[PDB]
Amino acid sequence: RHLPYFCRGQVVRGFGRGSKQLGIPTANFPEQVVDNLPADISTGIYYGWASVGSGDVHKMVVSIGWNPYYKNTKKSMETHIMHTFKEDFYGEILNVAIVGYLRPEKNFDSLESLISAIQGDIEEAKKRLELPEYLKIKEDNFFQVSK
Ligand SMILES: Cc1cc2nc3c(=O)[nH]c(=O)nc-3n(C[C@H](O)[C@H](O)[C@H](O)CO)c2cc1C
Numbered sequence: 776r777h778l779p780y781f782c783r784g785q786v787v788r789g790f791g792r793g794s795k796q797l798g799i800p801t802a803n804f805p806e807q808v809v810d811n812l813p814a815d816i817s818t819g820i821y822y823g824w825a826s827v828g829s830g831d832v833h834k835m836v837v838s839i840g841w842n843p844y845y846k847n848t849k850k851s852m853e854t855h856i857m858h859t860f861k862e863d864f865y866g867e868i869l870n871v872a873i874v875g876y877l878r879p880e881k882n883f884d885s886l887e888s889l890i891s892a893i894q895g896d897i898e899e900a901k902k903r904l905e906l907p908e909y910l911k912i913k914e915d916n917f918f919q920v921s922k
Pocket residue numbers: 792793794801820836837838853854855879880881882883889892893896897
């Protein structure tokens with residue numbers, strides 16, 4: 776319904792152990808950004824395009840989940856960009872276009888299944904983003920203003 780969804784936010788640290796440990800870093804935004812997501816952007820795994828500051832636009836996946844830790848009933852969002860960065864980018868602005876949905880969140884019985892699933896999401900996202908309908912969003916003025 777509300778795809779593509781465009782948003783921008785400062786990259787901020789998260790809690791627990793960071794998914795850098797898995798070789799799959801996931802960037803967070805301030806809760807203000809997540810809170811302004813339309814209700815119809817259900818939890819689950821999405822894909823799209825991202826850039827950092829005035830950088831180039833790269834493929835990405837986003838996980839939207841429920842936040843256990845805040846009162847009311849808040850969501851969480853984290854983005855893994857399919858690009859090798861040479862340094863962290865905490866405090867920079869991450870620009871995202873969420874363009875498609877992959878699947879609901881799932882319960883996994885092991886880290887082995889979870890990691891395999893995440894890697895599979897990343898591979899499927901790379902393929903879907905080649906479709907001309909999604910490939911063009913890479914060139915949206917949304918991103919062209921950020922350079
Ligand atoms: C693309 C992607 C898909 C994910 N899918 C799930 C999932 O289906 N179930 C889950 O419990 N966690 C999922 N996660 C959460 C992942 O376990 C999380 O990144 C770290 O555990 C904490 O940042 C996913 C993360 C990413 C980046």
